[PDB]
């Protein structure tokens, strides 16, 4: 059987996160899942329910938002030439 690997990008300052499915790619990704990896996905759904998955060279990610920015260090680098930038506290 094939499966979906998962990783979570978590910001302890804003108390938020985004997630990657890696190699699975976004053609097989939706905001809801019937696989499953955990009982609930609601912490992501709060924002992710309004976005489709965004495909990146690192992997397929929910809650990514395309901003076309370049930053030196997000403290959440995704490797390669990609970075998950935390938002700004009010």
């Amino acid at each position: 059987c094939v499966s979906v690997p998962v990783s979570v990008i978590y910001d302890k300052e804003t108390k938020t996160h985004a997630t990657l499915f890696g190699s699975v790619a976004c053609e097989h990704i939706s905001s809801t899942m019937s696989q499953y990896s955990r009982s609930t996905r609601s912490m992501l759904k709060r924002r992710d329910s309004t976005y489709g998955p965004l495909q990146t060279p690192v992997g397929c990610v929910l809650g990514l938002v395309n901003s076309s920015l370049f930053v030196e260090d997000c403290k959440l680098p995704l490797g390669q030439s990609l970075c998950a930038l935390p938002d700004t506290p009010s």
Binding site: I9, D11, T14, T16, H17, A18, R47, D48, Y51, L54, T56, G63, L64, V65, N66, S67, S68, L69, F70, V71, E72, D73, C74, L76, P77, Q80, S81, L82, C83, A84, L85, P86, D87, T88, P89, S90
Partner: protein
């Protein structure tokens, strides 16, 4: 409120592009504005010293345990002797390192050493501002040794919960440090008194006992800044130094990578013991980690099996501990020898290597003691506001093809300085400040096709 994390790429900031020219002249990018800053590193040199009383560690005073433990006595012999070796290596490393720190002669230090340079590292008579910042900011646990036992005894505060008190049951002992704070302070005060300076050659013989500030100015000439620039900006330079040093006020933070490493040296020793201690409550396939409970609730024919699992379990954890300590000791020994060389390369000398220290050639470095090691601070050079001028590869008397010169520790540039009437002027290699071209800044060389020709005025040679 905040939204979703954003997609950004990792930035690469492209270098300033300096176009290449053909022929006998070139575009030379020269900084016009210089400032200082600092970098830091931590060198862990120690592993906390350890000994274990196996008879007590494996079982808390039980004869059935000792009767079965006896079958395994050769194991604990290996454990203590292996640790004996590692603790000796730790002591030799520490004394051998401090031996290189000590000077044969030095200047006395009184407040005011540093001149216009703040030197917040002068002993607060003592230690340094930096040592107090490291020892107060890092969450390093209180030592025992004295008074010790009374605070772990019923004849003391009921609130004591020190991991040291637990040693009276664990059969574990924490060993004292080799030097004490006062001797370590004596060794680094000897280094402070050795500052000013590292010039005049040798210094491994004679001793000048000169101002801090002058050793700085000598080092700045040493990187290509001319003297006229330093003389005019000497107060500005002291202020920039002080600003760069001032950065250390915020440096002892969790966002400082060198600081974090100091904290980990502490944490790494804490876990080595916490793991030995927590294993004392771990079952090893055994019904209980407690011999007393094994005996109390089991018939004798079953108790030995439960105890044997416990013993082999405890011995297994001692094995892992020792293997880890032997590796840690050797890694620390390497680290200490590398520090020995750094003190003799950057603290006691100016570096010409790059890579090392401040990220821009080298200017004075300092070493202080730190939890489990040494902490180093390095002042670096950060030139900016570069301009582009056209430069020569050398100069010849136009009227005489064999009269040729080259710049010394700098460049000959087309004059753009209105105070110089002469077509060519000299700048240092690290700072733009065109000077008349004179013999102090030049050397006589074999003629080359790329040396530019002056038909007017070139004092070196004038004729």
């Amino acid at each position: 409120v905040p939204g979703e994390m954003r997609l950004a790429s990792i930035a690469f900031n492209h270098p300033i592009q300096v176009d290449q020219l053909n022929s006998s002249y070139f575009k030379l990018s020269i900084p016009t504005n210089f400032s200082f800053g600092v970098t830091q590193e931590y060198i862990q040199t120690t592993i906390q010293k350890v000994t274990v009383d196996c008879k007590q560690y494996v079982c808390n005073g039980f004869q059935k345990c000792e009767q079965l433990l006896r079958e395994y006595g050769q194991f604990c012999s290996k454990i203590n002797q292996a640790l004996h070796g590692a603790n000796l290596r730790q002591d030799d490393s520490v004394r051998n390192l401090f031996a290189s720190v000590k000077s044969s002669q030095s200047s006395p230090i009184i407040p005011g050493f540093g001149g216009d340079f703040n030197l917040t590292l002068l002993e607060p008579v003592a230690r340094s501002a930096i040592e107090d910042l490291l020892f107060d900011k890092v969450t390093i646990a209180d030592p025992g040794y004295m008074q010790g036992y009374d605070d772990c005894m019923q004849q003391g505060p009921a609130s004591a919960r020190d991991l040291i008190c637990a040693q009276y049951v664990a059969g574990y002992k924490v060993l004292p440090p080799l030097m004490d704070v006062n001797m370590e302070a004596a060794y680094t005060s000897s280094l402070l008194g050795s500052i000013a300076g590292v010039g005049w050659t040798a210094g491994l013989s004679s001793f000048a006992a000169i101002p801090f500030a002058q050793s700085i100015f000598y080092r700045l000439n040493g990187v290509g800044i001319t003297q006229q620039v330093l003389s005019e900006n000497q107060k500005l330079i002291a202020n920039k130094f002080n600003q760069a040093l001032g950065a250390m006020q915020t440096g002892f933070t969790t966002t400082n990578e060198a600081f974090h490493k100091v904290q980990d040296a502490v944490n790494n020793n804490a876990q080595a013991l916490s793991k030995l201690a927590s294993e004392l409550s771990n079952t090893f396939g055994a019904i209980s980690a407690s011999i007393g409970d094994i005996i109390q609730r089991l018939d004798v024919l079953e108790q030995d099996a439960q105890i044997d699992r416990l013993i082999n379990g405890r011995l297994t954890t001692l094995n892992a501990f020792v293997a880890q300590q032997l590796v840690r000791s050797e890694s620390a020994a390497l680290s200490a020898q590398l520090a020995k060389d750094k003190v003799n390369e950057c603290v006691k000398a100016q570096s010409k290597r790059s890579g090392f220290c401040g990220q821009g050639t080298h200017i004075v470095s300092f070493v202080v003691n730190a939890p489990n090691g040494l902490y180093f601070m390095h002042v670096g050079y950060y030139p900016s506001n570069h301009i582009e001028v056209v430069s020569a590869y050398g100069l010849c008397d136009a009227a005489n093809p064999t009269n040729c010169i080259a710049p010394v520790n700098g460049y000959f540039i087309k004059t753009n300085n209105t105070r110089i009437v002469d077509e060519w002027s000299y700048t240092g290699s690290s700072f733009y400040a065109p000077e008349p071209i004179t013999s102090l800044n030049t050397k006589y060389v074999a003629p080359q096709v790329t040396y530019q020709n002056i038909s007017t005025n070139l004092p070196p040679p004038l004729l």
